[PDB]
């Protein structure tokens, strides 16, 4: 694997998408709900992924529940991570949300989701029922339970937004602020799930803490390097934001964001910058990203079979109905 993930404009493979997945520069696809119009489609363009790399290479999507699932149809529905929390059964679901969720983008040949949501609040616009809770009890102890479902079928998680997203209640600007003197306790979720040693890997917030540094979290060596790596001793895999929303372009960018401490860089909705990367970034291995890679593999009917998919996909369904 490279460090580049990158996406592609739909259902199957072009001839240009081809030529690119087969660049060793390429770790990862990341899929969009665009990427997405059936079951045994989706099957098939993985598999055609896959088999145009030629090699190992990991195929993400940002499957949250809720606001943020793009692939609905043909799926269990998965509620907004907020949800868990509110019924009084919380722990018990919120490990069988994860480990639904989980298990079926695993059924159809998906390495892992970008999650879980680790901001707490409900305040930023963005984040909203994204969040498992308002107070850090309330969020470590539900998406602990989310991540251990997603480690029970063999998935790698990624905590997101270090150090956190939670609190971004303003808005005219290029890049959204935080002006807080502390932001201790947003960060207290991530330190605690790093020290517990549950994430694999870790998304930052492209979001300025400007009384800590002056870059956003996800282009900062202080945020990246200092804390994340020295202070808190995280040792999995670190992405950058999205480097399409100062720096230079495509090529400067991404080397921004590599000496700023990512490990893997993620470059969407713009083939042309992609491009660019592949064709002029010098090759270099990400090795360490070969422990995203999912752990089990299974079909789809052979999952229906465990009674453990039948109460779960029933109890998220009436979990979603119940607080409507």
Same mark, same amino acid.
């Given at each position: 694997? #490279?460090?580049?993930?990158?996406?592609? /404009?739909? *259902?199957?493979?072009? &001839? =240009?998408?081809?030529?690119? $997945? @087969?660049?060793?520069?390429?770790?990862?696809?990341?899929?969009?709900?665009?990427?997405?119009?059936?079951?045994?489609?989706?099957?098939?363009?993985?598999?055609?992924?896959?088999?145009?790399?030629?090699?190992?290479?990991?195929?993400?999507?940002?499957?949250?529940?809720?606001?943020?699932?793009?692939?609905?149809? #043909?799926?269990?529905?998965?509620?907004? /991570?907020? *949800?868990?929390?509110? &019924? =009084?059964?919380?722990?018990? $679901? @919120?490990?069988?949300?994860?480990?639904?969720?989980?298990?079926?983008?695993?059924?159809?040949?998906?390495?892992?989701?970008?999650?879980?949501?680790?901001?707490?609040?409900?305040?930023?616009?963005?984040?909203?029922?994204?969040?498992?809770?308002?107070?850090?009890?309330?969020?470590?102890?539900?998406?602990?339970?989310?991540?251990?479902?997603?480690?029970?079928?063999?998935?790698?998680?990624?905590?997101?937004?270090?150090?956190?997203?939670?609190?971004?209640?303003?808005?005219?600007?290029?890049?959204?602020?935080?002006?807080?003197?502390?932001?201790?306790?947003?960060?207290?979720?991530?330190?605690?799930?790093?020290?517990?040693?549950?994430?694999?890997?870790?998304?930052?917030?492209?979001?300025?803490?400007?009384?800590?540094?002056?870059?956003?979290?996800?282009?900062?060596?202080?945020?990246?390097?200092?804390?994340?790596?020295?202070?808190?001793?995280?040792?999995?895999?670190?992405?950058?934001?999205?480097?399409?929303?100062?720096?230079?372009?495509?090529?400067?960018?991404?080397?921004?964001?590599?000496?700023?401490?990512?490990?893997?860089?993620?470059?969407?909705?713009?083939?042309?910058?992609?491009?660019?990367?592949?064709?002029?970034?010098?090759?270099?291995?990400?090795?360490?990203?070969?422990?995203?890679?999912?752990?089990?593999?299974?079909?789809?009917?052979?999952?229906?079979?465990?009674?453990?998919?039948?109460?779960?996909?029933?109890?998220?369904?009436?979990?979603?109905?119940?607080?409507?």
């Amino acid at each position: 694997m #490279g460090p580049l993930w990158l996406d592609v /404009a739909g *259902y199957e493979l072009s &001839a =240009e998408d081809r030529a690119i $997945l @087969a660049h060793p520069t390429v770790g990862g696809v990341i899929l969009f709900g665009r990427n997405y119009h059936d079951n045994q489609q989706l099957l098939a363009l993985n598999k055609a992924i896959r088999q145009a790399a030629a090699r190992p290479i990991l195929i993400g999507v940002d499957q949250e529940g809720g606001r943020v699932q793009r692939f609905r149809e #043909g799926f269990s529905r998965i509620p907004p /991570a907020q *949800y868990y929390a509110r &019924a =009084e059964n919380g722990v018990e $679901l @919120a490990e069988q949300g994860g480990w639904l969720m989980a298990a079926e983008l695993i059924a159809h040949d998906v390495d892992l989701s970008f999650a879980p949501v680790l901001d707490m609040g409900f305040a930023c616009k963005a984040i909203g029922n994204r969040a498992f809770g308002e107070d850090v009890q309330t969020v470590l102890k539900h998406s602990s339970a989310f991540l251990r479902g997603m480690k029970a079928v063999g998935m790698a998680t990624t905590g997101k937004h270090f150090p956190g997203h939670g609190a971004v209640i303003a808005d005219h600007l290029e890049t959204p602020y935080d002006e807080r003197e502390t932001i201790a306790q947003d960060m207290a979720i991530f330190r605690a799930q790093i020290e517990a040693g549950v994430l694999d890997a870790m998304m930052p917030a492209h979001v300025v803490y400007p009384h800590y540094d002056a870059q956003p979290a996800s282009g900062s060596s202080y945020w990246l390097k200092q804390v994340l790596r020295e202070e808190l001793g995280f040792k999995g895999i670190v992405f950058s934001d999205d480097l399409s929303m100062v720096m230079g372009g495509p090529v400067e960018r991404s080397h921004q964001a590599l000496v700023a401490g990512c490990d893997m860089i993620l470059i969407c909705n713009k083939r042309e910058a992609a491009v660019e990367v592949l064709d002029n970034l010098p090759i270099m291995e990400v090795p360490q990203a070969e422990a995203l890679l999912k752990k089990q593999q299974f079909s789809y009917s052979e999952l229906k079979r465990l009674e453990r998919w039948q109460q779960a996909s029933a109890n998220m369904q009436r979990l979603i109905e119940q607080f409507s």
